[PDB]
Amino acid sequence: EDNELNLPNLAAAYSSILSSLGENPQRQGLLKTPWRAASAMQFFTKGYQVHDEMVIVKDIDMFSMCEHHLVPFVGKVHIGYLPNKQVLGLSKLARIVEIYSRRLQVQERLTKQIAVAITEALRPAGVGVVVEATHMSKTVTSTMLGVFREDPKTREEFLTLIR
Template identity: 45%
Template sequence: MEPHKGIVKVEGTARPPDPARLAGVIRDLLSALGEDPEREGLQRTPARVAEMLQEVLAGYWMDPADLINGAIFEVEDNDLVLVRDIEFYSMCEHHLLPFYGRAHVAYIPNGRIIGLSKIPRVVELFARRLQVQERMTRQIADFLEVVLHPQGVAVIVEAAHLCAMMRGVRKSHARMVTQALTGIFRTDPRHRNELLAHLRRPPEKL
């Protein structure tokens, strides 16, 4: 089956930014903070930070069609599909500090499924950019809706935010939970309860 080119719209740019330009910005930032970018410990910091930013914000430059890469298959079985405990790391767009946690992604097929490895990649597509958790949760759900047209999608995200842990209220144990439900997960409590029952079970060693 052909990937859905042109259907899945994800905001971003076609190519990563210029590393030299990024490094220059970091060098200026160090100077503005009163540091000496030429001292031994900081000489390579601008280049390192530029490389790091291109890695942790790589979601801006991922092509959704390449991500799917034809890994959509027709099936007759329309039972629950759940990938739980997907680790992710993202960057808060308000303070440029990381937030990280786990995403649980489920859907009820409607004759089509997506390759198992693609679901964590979808999470990365939206996590590896400047984000707020609420929007990221909804984007993951909407992406799967567009690609699969399933009976329903459920995305539940639990995360710790360094902007609340290091600054501001400084609550190191606070966790934020967001969810996005579509279709049958929103309208039928039986399917929601089935999903929650799976998530209540502790992960088993395989």
């Protein structure tokens, strides 16, 4: 309901942007652009709308938005954890990436959020979150909690297996 009500307001602002750039919004290729740009921005912010072995999900494709300039940034996320008593469904790990990445973000915050989500949900022995992105030269942010921070064997294993 919030998206359907805000969609016109976004398209109105996108039409204003086209006009403010010294461009004609009534052009053939630019007629549908305010609506399309609004729909795209809605998709990039849809997140605002859930054993005794190391479990890793590497190369998770991640699409987020720079909260400073409103320019997207793509990347990859590699999550790892050592369960205590609760295990998370591998599809749900990707949903955690998606909820936080589809938002006006900062890579450092986005990493911290994915690690905290896992920690709070499973209460595991250790968690490892690596985000490697190219912002529109790479930026790598890494969160190591529990046994992932304290155990050299555990951290070396996580870092090696995600390569």
